[PDB]
Amino acid sequence: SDQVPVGNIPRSITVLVEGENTRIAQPGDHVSVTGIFLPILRGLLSETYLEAHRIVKMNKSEDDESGAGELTREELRQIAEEDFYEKLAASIAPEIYGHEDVKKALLLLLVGGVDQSPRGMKIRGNINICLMGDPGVAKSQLLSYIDRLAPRSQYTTGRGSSGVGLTAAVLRDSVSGELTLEGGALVLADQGVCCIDEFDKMAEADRTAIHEVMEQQTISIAKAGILTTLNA
Amino acid sequence: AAGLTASVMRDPSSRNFIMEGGAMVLADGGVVCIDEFDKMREDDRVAIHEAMEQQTISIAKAGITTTLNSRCSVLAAAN
Amino acid sequence: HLEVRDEVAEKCQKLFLDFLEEFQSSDGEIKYLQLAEELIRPERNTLVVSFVDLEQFNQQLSTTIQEEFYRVYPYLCRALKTFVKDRKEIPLAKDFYVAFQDLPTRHKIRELTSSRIGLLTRISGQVVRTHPVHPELVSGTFLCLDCQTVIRDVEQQFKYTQPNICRNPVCANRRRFLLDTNKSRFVDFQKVRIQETQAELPRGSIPRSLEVILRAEAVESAQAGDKCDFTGTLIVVPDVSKLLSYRLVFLACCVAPTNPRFGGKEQTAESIKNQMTVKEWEKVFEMSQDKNLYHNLCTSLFPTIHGNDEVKRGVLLMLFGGVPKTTGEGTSLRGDINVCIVGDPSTAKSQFLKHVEEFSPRAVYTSGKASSAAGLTAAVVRDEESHEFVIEAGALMLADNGVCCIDEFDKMDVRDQVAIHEAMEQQTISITKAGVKATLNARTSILAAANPISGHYDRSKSLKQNINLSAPIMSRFDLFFILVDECNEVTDYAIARRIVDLHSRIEESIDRVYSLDDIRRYLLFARQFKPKISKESEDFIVEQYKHLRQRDGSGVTKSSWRI
Amino acid sequence: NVAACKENFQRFLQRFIDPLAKEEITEPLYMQRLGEINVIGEPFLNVNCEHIKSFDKNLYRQLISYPQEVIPTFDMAVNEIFFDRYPDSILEHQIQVRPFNALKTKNMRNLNPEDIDQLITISGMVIRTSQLIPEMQEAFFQCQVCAHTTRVEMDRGRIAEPSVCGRCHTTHSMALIHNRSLFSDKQMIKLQESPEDMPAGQTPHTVILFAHNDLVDKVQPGDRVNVTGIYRAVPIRVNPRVSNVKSVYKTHIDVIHYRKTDAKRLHGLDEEAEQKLFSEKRVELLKELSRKPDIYERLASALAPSIYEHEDIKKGILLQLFGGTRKDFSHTGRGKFRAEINILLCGDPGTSKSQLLQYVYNLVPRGQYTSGKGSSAVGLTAYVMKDPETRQLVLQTGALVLSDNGICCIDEFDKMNESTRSVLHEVMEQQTLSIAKAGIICQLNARTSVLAAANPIESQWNPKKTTIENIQLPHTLLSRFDLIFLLLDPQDEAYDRRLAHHLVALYYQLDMAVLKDYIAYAHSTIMPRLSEEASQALIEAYVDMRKIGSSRGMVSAYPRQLESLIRLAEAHAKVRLSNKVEAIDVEEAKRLHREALK
DNA sequence: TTTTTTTTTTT
Ligand SMILES: Nc1ncnc2c1ncn2[C@@H]1O[C@H](COP(=O)(O)OP(=O)(O)OP(O)(O)=S)[C@@H](O)[C@H]1O
Ligand SMILES: Nc1ncnc2c1ncn2[C@@H]1O[C@H](COP(=O)(O)OP(=O)(O)OP(O)(O)=S)[C@@H](O)[C@H]1O
Ligand SMILES: Nc1ncnc2c1ncn2[C@@H]1O[C@H](COP(=O)(O)OP(=O)(O)OP(O)(O)=S)[C@@H](O)[C@H]1O
Ligand SMILES: [Mg+2]
Ligand SMILES: [Mg+2]
Ligand SMILES: [Mg+2]
Ligand SMILES: [Zn+2]
Ligand SMILES: [Zn+2]
């Protein structure tokens, strides 16, 4: 929806993945596809689909380099230094002066603790962080940076998002009358980070829908089509 | 009825909001007469204030961003 | 070349024809030769043979019926067309139908497997819908077209079936026949839908339902809201659009109420005083002559409720009902009284309602938070099969002439308390919708239970400030029982004793006279009088209306919901 | 392929021995099973198709690869080893064989087309079922000329018409008589993958299963099963008229075996006949453990061995797993009587409430877990959905009805707007639910038991206000509960030190089958009836409660509490198998009711 | 292109 004329409607295309390219792409995802562009069989007008030959995920804005993601000994050089923890801290959003300690915690949030399970009693291993502070201290800059430094990330604003649009919503299809589930922000950001600025301005009934995701890290829906617990 | 100035109403068919230009958009150069200047709907009175101010009505709501030139004359009677 | 003797069917036809004549009642006087007498005057075409007597007279037969009831039904009906030729006034092409009853063993709508098709079963359930009555073609008479002959006696099977062979060696159209329709044989056909009865529901389950097909003089026995007891055979039915897919259907032959309050046969004092068995009638008389009756129905209807002696009385007077009158102009006075209860938490409100709804027959029970407007009164549903909008009956309708028990009456929405007032006022229910225009009767009496605003009943305000009902509704009740939990201690011993007694002697310590089955009889009897008013009583009444207004008079005191 | 396999299977069925234990060496394992099949009804043999993996490996290749050309052989080869008991008892139907697997094999997302038509095991949570559907097996034709009735069988999977009357030869006169043929049953069920075992940030799938003749009604919506059955794929036609079928097939699963017995949860109420299937060696153990002077505190303290002390809450949550007696009040016209216990937990944050719900929900079978804002009024009890195919309104069950035998944990009890909170008033006190909507006028019922958890208003227990003001719940809802546990956070340094010392320990690193069987027993063969000495301590225990709760303004007492004491008292007697309620069983469940609000 | 029931955004 970025690369669309100022107020035009986005157009779709159909992709027939088959063979070995299946199960590569997840819904709600940035992707790049390579394949022939053919018309559909069975007057002279024709409807067309893309017949995929290659599918590459471009989430990171460049590519998926998980195969080449191995580090080099010349980088183990750095990682083995005395203060490797302190180089990264200074190399987080360098455009922002000061805040030597906040950048030390925004890194722990990206690394995350460990999570136990003794006698069947789960303990979460993620970290949550709030940034109460005066106006003009570059908080919506720090958040915009931590958005781009995460494999799975999401960005949301308190005043432009409703409490059912964060967790998960049940919506009907006027073509079939059937109610289906649709993940929210916290679901699409399952193994990653979610960012909510303007957090004091979110409506008070749309904010208690986070107490569930912050402790047990599930979302338990019991609306009138569905009864389940998604993992978030 | 619909009102004096424009409204945004949820159409039964479309299930979406549509725009209702009231009287002051139909009176082109004409004259509009009003009585009981405290009875008109609060929103409507706000909008007539702005319409006599600028001489046009511009609603920016759910799916409606248009402008209607109001060119008429107000002859009001108070109480 | 010639057809084959279906021996198991014809032998059974023969033995049944014999049974019809030989079997006699307690005094000789063959009984199926006198019930088969009225079978000649028009509109009667079903003989009702009891099945237990066919067990007496024979037993190698019952096991053939109860196992081949579909093979041998087309013969147990011809063997009634011969047995009734001894009257000579029946139209020769008229046809009759046998209808069994009183089977020994019952079943449940969930025991109707697919190992039961073609047998003889018996089912009990409620009734949800009733479609209209139709004709159905059982045996068409195809007027041949080229031969101008008449191909005759061709049986249809769920379709038109267009038999295609002629007995004429020159039949130019083995694919074209215009059937006549003034000689062919039609039978009525109604199709209703029944729903699993209440006492069979496995816990935590939604009730199933099936289609039953009444197909005879039995065509409007079952109505919506009743609890009939059907007895026929389970059959399979194709999907005629592609003539596969099959679906089960019950093909009933007899239908009768599940528990007759009067076991004679099933409307004034004498018609009922006929069915009263000797003990029944010597007991009803004894009660009607009893003194202090008005205190032995309370003590015998609500045996586990200590106190509130002024609420049980009102509930009784609600059950008996007043006299319904119709003014000459065309209006109508309401005959039955409505009653509302309002009280503190845990004061036995829902217990009166549960008692009444389990005692009374044809009385429905609904909560307020889990209802609707179009669910109480009446709905409109698109049957795409008929592709038409038809009317569905609501809780205020399938409880007609009974009692509707509404619990938590003040939780209902603002717009759902409007439809109920439109019914409580005129005693009718109007419908004006997509393509439907109708006015339905509703002569129910309502028993409603509510809660004061903010938990407790505040005894320094009028009623209109303690409850959130509308203004019109509070006028249509005319009996209120405000209950309060006066913080006392002599009661808190009595109630304690009674509850612990009930819980220690679970089925005993209940010593009511006039067992519950008996009171239903007395109440079905005594609800057929229309008492009148003597002049002295009329004078008394007007004087009492005089003495009631002025209590509300100014100065000395004050009261709520002004008279 | 056929004769070569029964000979290799009979051997397995005869000579097999396992290093295992069953029903709490008796070499003839499957011969003992086959003997039990003879001493009772139920002609099904539950074979584990992994035992056949130890004894062999060339049938275990042919059972999970050609299952429909093998399982008939596995029936025949069992009918003959039934020779021992042939003359003794002669049942009628036949003997059966049902392979299965203790552990799952695949997910619902990794079913690939190299697995079409071969044994497969998945697991899920049944959502909804359907009504029976007939299915033809033996046709029955009849001529219009010769009136002669032949009966052709369906062999390959289709029915062929003869087209020649064996007598008259009119070359097509044989109509099909429907209601004289033979049918069998067929039900359609829908699974739904469990929340565990699914990928990152995705929504559950569903899979359609088809049951058959005898498995036709052996499962209910709301159950967690391990279905095992073949995996098939059948074509579909673009028109219901032409024979132009599509090229993308459509798959389902022809189920062969269910399994609802999971190890970690208690015994569901399908195993009440199975309680008579207890080793008499075990009833001694239970009856003897039930004699120690504190078996109450010894079983309670074995719930959730990760919470810190909280000694009373575990007492309450243990009495909730037994419940009062199930008395039969149909005679007194009163109606029915609730026998399960509803528990409310209120208290300031960090006090480990949600952990207790998360622990119980994982213990009891047939349970649910709900939350505050993610549950509506109708989603908890019963909704009405436009059925997609038939275009008709049909009823469905919510969460408080799917539990129905178990516990319905409702976390975040405060944050439910008063609309959806006033719905619990019916289902939690009368054990019923009366629905009156468009075309549906019915009355369900259930045997659930809520276990709710809330926070005080302001989320901080400020001791300036009164107890009936930190909770901020009405009275017509607080009285339907009978154990309102007020947890609090006192600032005793000793307590904080002990708790921290306990919590850190969770980072380094009694039995169950005693409790898991003690509970089944104490449910099956116990019915405490009150006494006259107990009944005389129950009257005063309610006449004092009134004077106490009246003044303080904490929580008033209505006669409903006097029933709860019963519910609690009896539930205590069941713990020790006492079969009779005496005095102490009232003092205990009175001290419990009093010392929870302080 | 109509009712009725249920969820979520909007004036
Ligand atoms: N220490 C800093 N280093 C770099 N840029 C800064 C610094 N302080 C302020 N800025 C800049 O000042 C602007 C601050 O805007 P934001 O980042 O939106 O402020 P904010 O913290 O979001 O304030 P609120 O919460 O939205 S009022 C940006 O252009 C920042 O780049
Ligand atoms: N006067 C009484 N005599 C005998 N039992 C009583 C009496 N009052 C209450 N009870 C018992 O206490 C319970 C009362 O609960 P209900 O009557 O169901 O509730 P209710 O009166 O409808 O109040 P709410 O508003 O709905 S909580 C039942 O178990 C009754 O048996
Ligand atoms: N007594 C205790 N025993 C064991 N763990 C405890 C105890 N008290 C606190 N905890 C731990 O502290 C945390 C408390 O979290 P919860 O159990 O979710 O509290 P809670 O009652 O859900 O809080 P709120 O009111 O809902 S925010 C968990 O990590 C528990 O493991
Ligand atoms: Mg900002
Ligand atoms: Mg009540
Ligand atoms: Mg919590
Ligand atoms: Zn002809
Ligand atoms: Zn023939």
Author numbering:
A (entry chain 7): 241 to 282, 291 to 480
B (entry chain 5): 411 to 489
C (entry chain 6): 15 to 257, 292 to 314, 320 to 616
D (entry chain 4): 158 to 181, 188 to 672, 682 to 770
Article sentences:
Here, we report the cryoEM structure at 3.3 Å of human CMG bound to a fork DNA substrate in the presence of ATPγS. A continuous chain of eleven thymidine nucleotides is bound in a right-handed B-form spiral within the C-tier channel of ATPase domains. The single-stranded (ss) DNA contacts all six MCM subunits, from MCM2 with its 5′-end to MCM5 with the 3′-end, and thus traverses all MCM interfaces except MCM2-5. Four MCM subunits, MCM6, 4, 7 and 3 make an identical set of contacts with DNA, involving both PS1 and H2I loops. Within each four-nucleotide footprint, an invariant serine at the start of loop H2I (MCM6 S425, MCM4 S539, MCM7 S410, MCM3 S419) is hydrogen bonded to the 5′-terminal phosphate, whilst an invariant lysine in loop PS1 (MCM6 K486, MCM4 K600, MCM7 K471, MCM3 K480) is ion paired to the subsequent phosphate. MCM6 F442—the aromatic residue in the [+]x6[Ω/Ψ] motif—unstacks the second and third nucleotide from the 5′-end of the DNA by inserting its side chain between the thymine bases. Three of the six MCM interfaces in the ring: MCM6-4, MCM4-7 and MCM7-3, are bound to ATPγS, whereas the MCM3-5 and MCM2-6 interfaces contain ADP as product of ATPγS hydrolysis, while the MCM2–5 interface is empty. In accordance with the apo status of MCM5, the MCM2-5 gate remains ajar and the MCM2–7 C-tier ring adopts a shallow right-handed spiral conformation. Several indicators point to MCM2 acting as a ‘seam subunit’ that has only partially engaged with the rest of the C-tier ring: the smaller interface area with MCM6 (1391 Å2, instead of ∼2000 Å2 for the other nucleotide-occupied MCM interfaces), the disordered conformation of its DNA-binding element H2I αN, and the higher B value attained during real-space refinement. The likely explanation for this observation is that the slowly-hydrolysable ATPγS nucleotide has permitted the engagement of the CMG helicase with the leading-strand portion of the fork DNA substrate but prevented its translocation to the ss-dsDNA nexus.
Unwinding of parental DNA in eukaryotic cells is performed by the 11-subunit Cdc45–MCM–GINS assembly or CMG. The six MCM proteins, MCM2–7, belong to the AAA+ family of ATPases and form a hetero-hexameric ring that translocates on single-strand DNA. In the absence of DNA substrate, MCM2–7 adopts predominantly an open spiral conformation; the co-factors Cdc45 and GINS—a hetero-tetramer of Psf1–3 and Sld5—bind to the MCM5-2 interface and lock MCM2–7 into the closed-ring conformation required for robust DNA unwinding. The 11-subunit assembly of the human CMG shows the familiar architecture first demonstrated for the yeast and Drosophila CMG: a two-tiered ring of MCM2–7 proteins, with the Cdc45 and GINS coactivators bound together to the N-tier portion of MCM2, MCM5 and MCM3, so that Cdc45 faces the MCM2-5 interface of ATPase domains.
